[PDB]
Amino acid sequence: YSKYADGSDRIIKPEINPVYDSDDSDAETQNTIGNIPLSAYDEMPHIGYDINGKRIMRPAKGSALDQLLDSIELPEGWTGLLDKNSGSSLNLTKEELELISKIQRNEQTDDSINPYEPLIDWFTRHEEV
Amino acid sequence: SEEEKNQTKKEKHSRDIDIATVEAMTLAHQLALGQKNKHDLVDEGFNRYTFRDTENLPDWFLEDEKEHSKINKPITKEAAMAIKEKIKAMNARPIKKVAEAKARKRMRAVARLEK
Amino acid sequence: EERVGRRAANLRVLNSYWVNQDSTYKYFEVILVDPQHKAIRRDARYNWICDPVHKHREARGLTATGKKSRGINKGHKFNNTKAGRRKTWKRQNTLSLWRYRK
Amino acid sequence: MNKQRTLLISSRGVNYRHRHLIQDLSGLLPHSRKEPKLDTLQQLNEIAELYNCNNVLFFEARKHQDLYLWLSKPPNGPTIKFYIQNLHTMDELNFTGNCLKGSRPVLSFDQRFESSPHYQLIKELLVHNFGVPPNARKSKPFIDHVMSFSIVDDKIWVRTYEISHSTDISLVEIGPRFVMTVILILEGSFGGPKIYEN
Amino acid sequence: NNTKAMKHALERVQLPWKKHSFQEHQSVTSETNTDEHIKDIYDDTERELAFYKQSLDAVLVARDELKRLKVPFKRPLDYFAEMVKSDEHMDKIKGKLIEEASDKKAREEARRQRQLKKFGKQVQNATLQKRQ
RNA sequence: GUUUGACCUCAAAUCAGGUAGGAGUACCCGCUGAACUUAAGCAUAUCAAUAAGCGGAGGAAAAGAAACCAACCGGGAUUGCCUUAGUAACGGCGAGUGAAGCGGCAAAAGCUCAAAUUUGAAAUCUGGUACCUUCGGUGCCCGAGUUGUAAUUUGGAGAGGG
């Protein structure tokens, strides 16, 4: 479109917009404490601080009955580690648990695809002279 | 009595869902702590072993495939901890077996004064 | 290559290639020449294998993959193993003393 | 209102110390999309186009002692070739002090950066490239360090000082202390005629 | 070295900072400091202090303008978030500092104990005869 | 045709003919692998990619005709000797470890397959068998083999015609 300072033409591309997509090896954090142990905050009424500095309070004061229930019949997506957002145990969604099993028995991860597509002869369609 | 038969469809589902292996546990961590999202695992899901029929095939063939269709993915100690915390049942360490364990170690402490 | 060298001790391991692999086992297809066969002992392109300097080439890593694992090639990168790592170690770790001392 | 992203890339030929510079800058910059390695010039615009990068830090090393940073804006921006002489990394023991990993720095500058439009351009590019956006995803709130930039003997001396509090304020120097000798400025990104020479 | 295209570059690249808040820019320019006033230009002892003075200036100005807005400045000592240098690394530096302090004290007590071995006898007999 | 016949794969036979093991082991090619010691007590390190153990070869073995070195006014397979040189580089930058190109010299040597149709003709080979001028040759027969044996071609190109 336009040119350089000396004799040559340049291609003006539109500006690059820094967007955190569906996958960028990083997600919305909202707890903002890194690879530190959650041994800290076990004596606090909050789990860390976030951007623009305010107190991320611990969400609930559960019963002793429910805590004993979750150490006999463990929750559905129970993972044994502690969440960063809150001191409560990080569970897994039904869809993720389905996805782990479908890796281990190999069972077709990306759906809406055919395992057995007809061989579309993209090259033999046209005969050679 | 319909829910008596409809809830069991979830109760049997969450047995084919729950984590059993260290190899599944690591990937559950890699999800839980933000290292890999859904989109990353859907990429990794396409293996050397994808696009394989399993329902039509005779059992004497699948029982030799499934033994040898395990991709050795890297593990952590962090995952092995939780999977040992998941399998440990109720009667694993009662008062009886604790007292018996001390009854063993007292006998050992006696046997080293027998010399 | 070594296992097929022992089960078929009359033959000589020429080369081997990959055929199929698995979680537990990697498969290969070794290729073997009969040096005692008269169709090999004539024809001057293959009778080099009958020379007794090729008795078990696979046991001494003289095959393609053995020469790879020994690290035998050319250059800066293979200086520690170009004439063989045992040979070069023994050579460079030798106090060489002359009649008229250098 | 300010929304930017940096691409941290390397070349084959980068040694121990220079690898530690890519480590520590990826630490200090919360908007640093850290990338492993590149082998070859024209590709770097396209890498930036994939990750929606507003900036590209290309660390080159021709002879293995040297370092040449190619700071740039990807689509049509003026790229700047440096030669970084002195180096003292993050993991040098004489420096004492913890900055927060990727908190908002405060950019310090000099009088002589406004002397020419030449030094004015590097001043601006150091503001938004070496700086920070107000809402970067890995960025920590409470401000904890600075970025000292100053020119003496035609070269810009870069330091990162953690501010120290007592109960008014001190500041102990840490991090990558290095000079930047402005070698070359291209017209477009890694292409076109050269504007500035030494 | 044409400054024309350089100004054209300043047209495209720049974002209006004066037309917005300080928070979007956050860059206190230490103008009125050329940093050419330094004596011993290749000795880097006065230069360290001069750079320190410049840094401290920009900190104070940024403290004022950021206090003008309703955005906090100080680390509250209530968030224990991830830091640049690791804890084991900080234990290495602190280890080194306590090592050098203990070595300095070792040489101070070295002078002390040597003096005690040299004049210990005279200490005994002087204190005893003074007691008598 | 509910029969007969091609193949494919897998067997057996005191079948015909062969071949492998064990010894020696200085040197040579691999695999496997310590410790005493030395470093200041000492998880690195060092002795040491050593000794012991295990396999495999010959008169030599191995290596070897560049996915080599360089930065020149460019050299040109390997191996060995003098030199590089205690140099470059490694290392609580500690004890210590530690090359290579160049230059000189010893000795020198180059080649061969796979991948492009012999398709106007499997031109190839092993065995059995009868003779002969017998480390073999010739005749006939059973086979191997087109899922490829022969001739041509290997980058220094090369091939088909004139």
PDB file of C-alpha atoms in Angstrom, chain A residues 37-128:
ATOM      1  CA  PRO A  37       2.636 -23.508  49.227  1.00  0.00           C
ATOM      2  CA  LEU A  38      -0.903 -23.099  50.611  1.00  0.00           C
ATOM      3  CA  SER A  39       0.609 -23.926  54.029  1.00  0.00           C
ATOM      4  CA  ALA A  40       0.416 -20.141  54.406  1.00  0.00           C
ATOM      5  CA  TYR A  41      -3.182 -18.780  54.718  1.00  0.00           C
ATOM      6  CA  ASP A  42      -4.172 -21.860  56.792  1.00  0.00           C
ATOM      7  CA  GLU A  43      -4.124 -19.505  59.789  1.00  0.00           C
ATOM      8  CA  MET A  44      -5.707 -16.603  57.835  1.00  0.00           C
ATOM      9  CA  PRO A  45      -9.404 -15.835  57.095  1.00  0.00           C
ATOM     10  CA  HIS A  46      -8.408 -15.256  53.418  1.00  0.00           C
ATOM     11  CA  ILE A  47      -6.550 -16.897  50.510  1.00  0.00           C
ATOM     12  CA  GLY A  48      -4.191 -14.207  49.149  1.00  0.00           C
ATOM     13  CA  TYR A  49      -4.771 -10.908  47.352  1.00  0.00           C
ATOM     14  CA  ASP A  50      -5.742 -10.070  43.742  1.00  0.00           C
ATOM     15  CA  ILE A  51      -5.192  -7.292  41.152  1.00  0.00           C
ATOM     16  CA  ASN A  52      -6.282  -3.859  42.478  1.00  0.00           C
ATOM     17  CA  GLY A  53      -5.693  -5.133  46.056  1.00  0.00           C
ATOM     18  CA  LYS A  54      -8.658  -6.560  47.971  1.00  0.00           C
ATOM     19  CA  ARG A  55      -9.234  -9.441  50.424  1.00  0.00           C
ATOM     20  CA  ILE A  56     -10.188 -12.745  48.737  1.00  0.00           C
ATOM     21  CA  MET A  57     -12.155 -14.188  51.667  1.00  0.00           C
ATOM     22  CA  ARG A  58     -12.518 -17.943  52.303  1.00  0.00           C
ATOM     23  CA  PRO A  59     -16.005 -18.717  50.927  1.00  0.00           C
ATOM     24  CA  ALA A  60     -17.729 -20.971  53.496  1.00  0.00           C
ATOM     25  CA  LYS A  61     -17.605 -22.375  57.033  1.00  0.00           C
ATOM     26  CA  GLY A  62     -18.676 -25.985  56.402  1.00  0.00           C
ATOM     27  CA  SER A  63     -19.995 -28.457  58.974  1.00  0.00           C
ATOM     28  CA  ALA A  64     -17.912 -31.192  60.646  1.00  0.00           C
ATOM     29  CA  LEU A  65     -20.478 -33.715  59.316  1.00  0.00           C
ATOM     30  CA  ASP A  66     -19.850 -32.779  55.651  1.00  0.00           C
ATOM     31  CA  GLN A  67     -16.047 -32.881  56.086  1.00  0.00           C
ATOM     32  CA  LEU A  68     -16.263 -36.412  57.546  1.00  0.00           C
ATOM     33  CA  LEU A  69     -18.603 -37.398  54.679  1.00  0.00           C
ATOM     34  CA  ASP A  70     -15.968 -36.223  52.160  1.00  0.00           C
ATOM     35  CA  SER A  71     -13.303 -38.429  53.825  1.00  0.00           C
ATOM     36  CA  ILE A  72     -15.442 -41.600  53.571  1.00  0.00           C
ATOM     37  CA  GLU A  73     -17.381 -41.183  50.307  1.00  0.00           C
ATOM     38  CA  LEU A  74     -15.044 -38.795  48.479  1.00  0.00           C
ATOM     39  CA  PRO A  75     -16.557 -36.223  46.002  1.00  0.00           C
ATOM     40  CA  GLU A  76     -17.115 -36.977  42.288  1.00  0.00           C
ATOM     41  CA  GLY A  77     -14.127 -35.118  40.776  1.00  0.00           C
ATOM     42  CA  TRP A  78     -11.944 -35.378  43.917  1.00  0.00           C
ATOM     43  CA  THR A  79      -8.313 -34.611  43.114  1.00  0.00           C
ATOM     44  CA  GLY A  80      -6.493 -34.509  46.491  1.00  0.00           C
ATOM     45  CA  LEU A  81      -4.975 -31.055  45.949  1.00  0.00           C
ATOM     46  CA  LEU A  82      -6.036 -27.633  47.256  1.00  0.00           C
ATOM     47  CA  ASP A  83      -7.496 -24.898  45.017  1.00  0.00           C
ATOM     48  CA  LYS A  84      -5.809 -21.480  44.635  1.00  0.00           C
ATOM     49  CA  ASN A  85      -9.089 -19.474  44.596  1.00  0.00           C
ATOM     50  CA  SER A  86     -10.263 -20.988  47.889  1.00  0.00           C
ATOM     51  CA  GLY A  87      -9.049 -23.437  50.576  1.00  0.00           C
ATOM     52  CA  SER A  88     -11.793 -25.882  49.492  1.00  0.00           C
ATOM     53  CA  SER A  89     -10.832 -29.048  47.575  1.00  0.00           C
ATOM     54  CA  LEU A  90     -10.474 -28.611  43.804  1.00  0.00           C
ATOM     55  CA  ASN A  91     -12.980 -30.907  42.084  1.00  0.00           C
ATOM     56  CA  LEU A  92     -13.351 -31.876  38.406  1.00  0.00           C
ATOM     57  CA  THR A  93     -16.275 -31.358  36.005  1.00  0.00           C
ATOM     58  CA  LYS A  94     -18.136 -34.347  34.476  1.00  0.00           C
ATOM     59  CA  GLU A  95     -16.825 -33.415  31.000  1.00  0.00           C
ATOM     60  CA  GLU A  96     -13.161 -33.369  32.114  1.00  0.00           C
ATOM     61  CA  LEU A  97     -13.498 -36.735  33.914  1.00  0.00           C
ATOM     62  CA  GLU A  98     -15.062 -38.116  30.704  1.00  0.00           C
ATOM     63  CA  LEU A  99     -12.107 -36.686  28.741  1.00  0.00           C
ATOM     64  CA  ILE A 100      -9.465 -38.359  30.986  1.00  0.00           C
ATOM     65  CA  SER A 101     -11.157 -41.778  30.602  1.00  0.00           C
ATOM     66  CA  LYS A 102     -11.458 -41.239  26.824  1.00  0.00           C
ATOM     67  CA  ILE A 103      -7.671 -40.664  26.707  1.00  0.00           C
ATOM     68  CA  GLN A 104      -6.894 -43.875  28.646  1.00  0.00           C
ATOM     69  CA  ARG A 105      -9.165 -46.125  26.552  1.00  0.00           C
ATOM     70  CA  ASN A 106      -8.257 -43.932  23.509  1.00  0.00           C
ATOM     71  CA  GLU A 107     -11.995 -43.499  22.593  1.00  0.00           C
ATOM     72  CA  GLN A 108     -12.007 -40.548  20.083  1.00  0.00           C
ATOM     73  CA  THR A 109     -11.373 -37.267  21.984  1.00  0.00           C
ATOM     74  CA  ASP A 110     -12.479 -34.700  19.363  1.00  0.00           C
ATOM     75  CA  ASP A 111     -16.077 -35.555  18.423  1.00  0.00           C
ATOM     76  CA  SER A 112     -18.094 -34.283  15.381  1.00  0.00           C
ATOM     77  CA  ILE A 113     -15.556 -36.169  13.218  1.00  0.00           C
ATOM     78  CA  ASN A 114     -15.884 -39.475  11.363  1.00  0.00           C
ATOM     79  CA  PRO A 115     -13.226 -42.103  12.139  1.00  0.00           C
ATOM     80  CA  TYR A 116     -14.029 -43.603   8.721  1.00  0.00           C
ATOM     81  CA  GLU A 117     -14.174 -40.887   6.039  1.00  0.00           C
ATOM     82  CA  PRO A 118     -14.492 -41.988   2.376  1.00  0.00           C
ATOM     83  CA  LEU A 119     -11.138 -41.607   0.553  1.00  0.00           C
ATOM     84  CA  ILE A 120     -11.780 -38.453  -1.484  1.00  0.00           C
ATOM     85  CA  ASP A 121      -9.365 -38.960  -4.390  1.00  0.00           C
ATOM     86  CA  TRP A 122      -8.144 -35.353  -4.640  1.00  0.00           C
ATOM     87  CA  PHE A 123      -5.331 -36.312  -7.059  1.00  0.00           C
ATOM     88  CA  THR A 124      -6.576 -39.220  -9.263  1.00  0.00           C
ATOM     89  CA  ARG A 125      -9.690 -37.231 -10.350  1.00  0.00           C
ATOM     90  CA  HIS A 126      -7.693 -35.760 -13.256  1.00  0.00           C
ATOM     91  CA  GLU A 127      -6.138 -38.186 -15.758  1.00  0.00           C
ATOM     92  CA  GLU A 128      -2.561 -37.665 -16.965  1.00  0.00           C
TER      93      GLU A 128
END
